[PDB]
Design a protein around this ligand. Structure first.
Ligand code: FES
Ligand code: FES
Ligand SMILES: [Ca+2]
Ligand SMILES: [Ca+2]
Ligand SMILES: [Pr+3]
Ligand SMILES: [Pr+3]
Ligand SMILES: [Pr+3]
Ligand SMILES: [Pr+3]
Ligand SMILES: [Pr+3]
Ligand SMILES: [Pr+3]
Lengths: 156, 156
């Protein structure tokens, strides 16, 4: 089905949506230092939101551009970084924010991923970082700029 | 399809899940005062999580019981409240936590819902509170104790 199609580069990132038309994530809507948003890729032609495949679940956050690791910075757009939100431990959605670390927290077993340093695991049992998705801005809007730089989710 | 069935009383609450087997939310995992978790209802016997219907999207948080408004506490289980996470403004998932207010925040246009006082709108444009889901504990696991108390999401 179109809703279960994988993320492709050029997909528009949209805020996680309940019913109705989706909202593209604009750069100007993300304030540096604010908690991440959960996001999905939307086919730029068909405008189908690929929210039916859980491997397309994203977290998106704006950091101070001079706080990002050089390796993280090269895939960021104006301090904006995106990562897979599928926990690498047992596949829970990494849905919570740790304010003092500016890290992503998994509620299931306390996995914490250090986002400014490539989502390095700094707590709990994830065996590996969630992978980063390359982002770019086009006409004010966040767009997927590449494939995930890594396998998504629980890897057998 | 079964992943799209509406939420029913008796459904087990599970942590939002990528691929794979879901994790029931147990009362003991929820620390009073911690940010909410995004969740879905799961059929107790078939073990089908109803996450393909976005109107089943829940937020779950544990409060100090004596800070809940009387009406809210009537449908809480040892301080744990659940609400629909579909924004009543334009349908975005209410996915963020406001730590100083203990409030759920919609990132689309800044709707903020006062969880301890029945998800009362305290910022942004939502026309009305997200509705509460009554919850109870069954063998240490969080379960739907009734139906959503009002209509879910954007009014049609
Ligand atoms: S599934 Fe995320 S820490 Fe276990
Ligand atoms: S959709 Fe939540 S404030 Fe607009
Ligand atoms: Ca503008
Ligand atoms: Ca126990
Ligand atoms: Pr449409
Ligand atoms: Pr910082
Ligand atoms: Pr700076
Ligand atoms: Pr490089
Ligand atoms: Pr253009
Ligand atoms: Pr019983």
């Amino acid at each position: 089905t179109p809703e279960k199609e994988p993320l492709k580069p050029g997909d528009i990132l949209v805020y996680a949506q309940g019913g109705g038309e989706p909202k593209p994530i604009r750069l100007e809507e993300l304030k540096p230092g604010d908690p991440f948003v959960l996001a999905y890729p939307m086919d730029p032609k068909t405008k189908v939101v690929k929210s039916g495949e859980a491997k397309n679940t994203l977290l998106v956050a704006r950091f101070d551009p001079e706080e990002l690791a050089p390796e993280v910075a090269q895939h960021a757009a104006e301090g904006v970084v995106a990562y897979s939100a599928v926990c690498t431990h047992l596949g829970c959605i990494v849905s919570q924010w740790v304010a003092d670390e500016e890290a992503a927290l998994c509620p299931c077993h306390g996995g914490v991923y250090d986002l400014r340093h490539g989502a390095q695991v700094i707590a709990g049992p994830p065996p590996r970082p969630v992978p980063q998705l390359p982002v770019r801005v086009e006409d004010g809007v966040l767009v997927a700029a590449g494939e995930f730089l890594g396998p998504v989710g629980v890897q057998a």
